[PDB]
């Protein structure tokens, strides 16, 4: 037949038209012509180059564009819309033959090529679907709410004859109903027959639940949902919580026995998938020499310190601390008998309305391994380890808190002052020993909790009391406070000039939202490379200065009658110097980095003190 001949159907329906041998041969030949005769604007072989990159990675799936097939040959597009199931087998055999025609012996490295249609005009919401859409090609949006594991499905099945012990050859599984045999060719029997698990070849299977995105739902109504089945290379692509675009076929579950089941005869529906798309920190040798180049510009430190929370006004000290705790340091083991941690903890104590949660939000978008938990609220993760039951699989699971789940990363605790006793015990253990212990339901174990803590809290009453020390404004205890390196105090001092700029910035935000800076994308990757390969050094020519600095700050602290100074302050000094040095991708901690570090600790100590002590110290420590 010819192409304009096919567009006069001479059968009861499309399905019976497509299955006739003469029309199948025609469409197979015309698909070969489409594969090997396309040309872009310039004329490049759009599918030729795709079929040669098929060879290199050796993939088993091919991408086709509906726009091109509508451009060339329209009856094929109509049949693809109406009866895709029959079309896709024919189209997949054509692709496999064409690939072999350009890569010989690829039928061994892979035995079947899958076609996935990329673009398609009509896009539906889950609530619009009706019974006129059954057995048709559809494209939908939604959000992924649940996910199952990977189960194997039968592809090439071998049977045993339990009288003459023979293995009957490959039989194909259609993904509709289970296949059963009835005749043994060697002994001529219809006896018992069982599937040979060892000689069978299987396929990947997974199921997902799609929900209407909350934003689009018209007022007053509720979101609808549907189920999606993914086969082979599509398993484990979209993790729960993301928005996806699905191209597939709309089908009925042939439930079971329609007998019994008294009541109206209703049926259930599913979607069988063809393509999924979404609607990183790995780097390359192109960007490595750009890293090194930016590292040679004097003053990379102040660029980084102004590339942090790029939408909160002022608060330079907290941004410096954020950078320090977002780069890190070097963990240490002295001959397997002494450990000094590497991460630097940061506490925020501030009055209501100073944008602490905004910085905590930024840290989570900027970091690799960051987790969020709340003290007094509703969060998807707690702080205590436990053994609970899985609602879906009905299994017992071991779950750790955010502290365990955020190993070698950062943990973000919001509303740090409203914890119950259990959460406080967990936090203390994690910060002190850096490992979580559990003895529940026969499980005795210790887990690793090498994590960085950033926390936010509100004083007692609601406002800061400058006439008393830090320990008497907040409900936390000295054991916990002493385990933090840097303490930041945000004070709502009524100053006339500052309000001008604060209100200006805030009003500009609303006005603009009506219906130095390094780019964030490069900073994200620079942070990972630096923390992966940069372990700066401490050559001891520079020991004389710090000995005498510590001596002076110890002699002054006891004289003034305030907090004691212990060696944890010097350890913090060195650990922060490591971070300032690592900022410059450096090779030997400089004295400039040490001097920059000294300010942070001295300022923290001076600013966390009573008014009288603070006036004494702010004059005594003027040189550092």
């Amino acid at each position: 037949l010819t192409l304009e001949s096919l567009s006069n159907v001479k059968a009861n329906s499309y399905s019976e038209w497509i299955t006739q041998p003469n029309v199948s041969r025609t469409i197979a030949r015309e698909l070969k012509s489409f594969l090997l005769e396309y040309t872009d604007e310039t004329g490049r072989s759009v599918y030729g180059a795709r079929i040669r990159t098929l060879g290199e990675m050796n993939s088993e799936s091919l991408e086709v564009n509906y726009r091109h097939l509508a451009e060339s040959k329209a009856i094929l597009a109509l049949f693809l819309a109406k009866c895709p199931e029959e079309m896709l087998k024919i189209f997949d055999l054509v692709a496999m033959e064409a690939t072999e025609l350009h890569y010989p012996d690829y039928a061994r490295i892979h035995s079947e090529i899958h076609v996935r249609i990329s673009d398609f005009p009509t896009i539906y919401s889950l609530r619009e679907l009706r019974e006129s859409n059954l057995s048709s090609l559809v494209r939908v949006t939604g959000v992924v709410t649940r996910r199952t594991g990977v189960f194997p499905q039968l592809k090439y099945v071998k049977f045993n004859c339990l009288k003459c012990g023979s293995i009957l050859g490959p039989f194909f599984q259609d993904s509709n109903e289970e296949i059963r045999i009835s005749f043994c060719t060697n002994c001529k029997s219809k006896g018992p027959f069982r599937v040979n698990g060892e000689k069978t070849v299987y396929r990947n299977y997974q199921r997902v639940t799609l929900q209407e995105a909350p934003g689009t739902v018209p007022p007053g109504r509720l979101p609808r949902h549907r189920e999606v089945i993914l086969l082979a290379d599509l398993v484990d692509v979209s993790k729960p919580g993301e928005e996806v675009e699905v191209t597939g076929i709309y089908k009925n579950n042939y439930d079971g026995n329609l007998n019994a089941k008294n009541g109206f005869p209703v049926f259930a529906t599913i979607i069988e998938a063809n393509s999924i798309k979404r609607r990183v920190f790995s780097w390359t040798e192109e960007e490595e020499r750009e890293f090194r180049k930016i590292s040679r510009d004097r003053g990379i430190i102040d660029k980084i310190i102004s590339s942090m929370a790029p939408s909160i006004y002022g608060h330079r000290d907290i941004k410096t601390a954020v950078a320090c705790s977002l780069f890190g340091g070097v963990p240490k083991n002295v001959n397997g008998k002494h450990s000094i941690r590497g991460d630097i903890n940061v506490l925020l104590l501030g009055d209501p309305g100073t944008a602490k949660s905004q910085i905590l939000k930024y840290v989570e978008k900027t970091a690799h391994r960051a987790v969020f938990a709340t003290g007094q609220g509703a969060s998807a993760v707690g702080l205590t380890a436990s053994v609970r039951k899985d609602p879906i699989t009905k299994e017992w699971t071991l779950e750790g808190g955010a502290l365990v789940l955020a190993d070698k990363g950062v943990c973000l605790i919001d509303e740090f002052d409203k914890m119950n006793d259990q959460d406080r015990t967990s936090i203390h253990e994690a910060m002190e020993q850096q490992s979580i212990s559990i003895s529940k339901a026969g499980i005795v174990t210790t887990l690793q909790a090498r994590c960085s803590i950033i926390a936010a809290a509100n004083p007692n009453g609601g406002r800061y009391n400058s006439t008393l020390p830090l320990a008497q404004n907040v409900s936390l205890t000295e054991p916990i406070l002493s385990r933090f390196d840097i303490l930041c105090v945000v004070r709502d001092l009524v100053d006339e000039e500052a309000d001008e700029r604060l209100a200006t910035f805030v009003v500009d935000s609303h006005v603009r939202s009506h219906p130095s800076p390094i780019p964030q994308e490069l900073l994200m990757k620079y942070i990972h490379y630096a923390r992966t390969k940069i372990y700066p050094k401490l050559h001891q020519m520079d020991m004389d200065k710090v000995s005498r600095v510590y001596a002076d700050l110890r002699r002054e602290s006891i004289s003034t009658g305030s907090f004691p100074i212990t060696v944890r302050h010097l350890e913090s000094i060195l650990r922060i110097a490591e971070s300032f040095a690592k900022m410059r991708l450096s090779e030997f901690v400089s004295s400039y980095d040490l001097d920059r570090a000294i300010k942070v600790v001295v300022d923290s100590f001076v600013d966390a003190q009573k008014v009288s002590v603070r006036r004494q110290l702010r004059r005594s420590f003027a040189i550092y």
């Binding site: 001891q540 020991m543 000995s547 001596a551 110890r554 010097l570 350890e571």
Partner: protein
């Protein structure tokens, strides 16, 4: 102040132990120099060799 009221618990708990070690952080420049030097060498790498 007596050691008894220097602890936030009952004083009969002390009779349970065998050795009671009270460590006092006394300020003195010469000790400070030595301890600071000790810490700074451990962070250098000297104590590892």
């Amino acid at each position: 102040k007596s050691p008894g009221d220097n602890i936030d618990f009952q004083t009969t708990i002390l009779s349970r132990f065998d050795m009671i070690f009270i460590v006092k952080d006394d300020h003195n420049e010469e000790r400070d120099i030595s301890i600071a030097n000790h810490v700074i060498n451990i962070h250098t790498g000297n104590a590892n060799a």
